[PDB]
Design a binder for this molecule. Structure first.
Ligand SMILES: [Ca+2]
Ligand SMILES: [Ca+2]
Ligand SMILES: [Ca+2]
Length: 165
């Protein structure tokens, strides 16, 4: 019964702070942190600052996802900062930054990364990965996919929920 949520959060609400703690994401630097906060936000849908059971379930549904399609749409909306339906070179840049902000990321330096990533994934070379390009791109190119994953360790998350559960 997913009211093992109530076990951890007797008040009925989980807060951004507990979130970080629960996920070890406590103590990050300015960027690595600010980012974790961006993540937490996408889950607290009713933007009230807490993650209540309803937002909570929506999150675990997405986490336990067996299929990666959903998780990718998630990373996509998450990086498509200006939500213009597209991910430009900047948004992806930051995306890389944050990954490199909570990881001393191995040689890939934005300059390098952003291009390799764009060459491969930017199918119609418009300079923007569409949802189609991004999902499909990241999918059939499991190399840069680990860079994405690094942004938000799903599974690490799945491990922790489906453990002390
Ligand atoms: Ca909320
Ligand atoms: Ca955009
Ligand atoms: Ca394109």
């Amino acid at each position: 019964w997913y009211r093992t949520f109530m076990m951890e959060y007797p008040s009925g609400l989980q807060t951004l702070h507990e979130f970080k703690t629960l996920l070890g994401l406590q103590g990050l630097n300015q960027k690595a942190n600010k980012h974790i906060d961006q993540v937490y936000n996408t889950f607290d849908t009713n933007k009230d600052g807490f993650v209540d059971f309803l937002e909570f379930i929506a999150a675990v549904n997405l986490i336990m996802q067996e299929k990666m399609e959903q998780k990718l749409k998630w990373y996509f909306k998450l990086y498509d900062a200006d939500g213009n339906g597209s991910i430009d070179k900047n948004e992806l840049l930051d995306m890389f930054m944050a990954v490199q902000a909570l990881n001393g990321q191995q040689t890939l330096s934005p300059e390098e990364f952003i291009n390799l990533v764009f060459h491969k994934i930017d199918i119609n070379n418009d300079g923007e990965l569409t949802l189609e390009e991004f999902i499909n791109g990241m999918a059939k190119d499991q190399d840069l996919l680990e860079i994405v994953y690094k942004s938000f360790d799903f599974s690490n998350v799945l491990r922790v929920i489906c453990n002390g559960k």
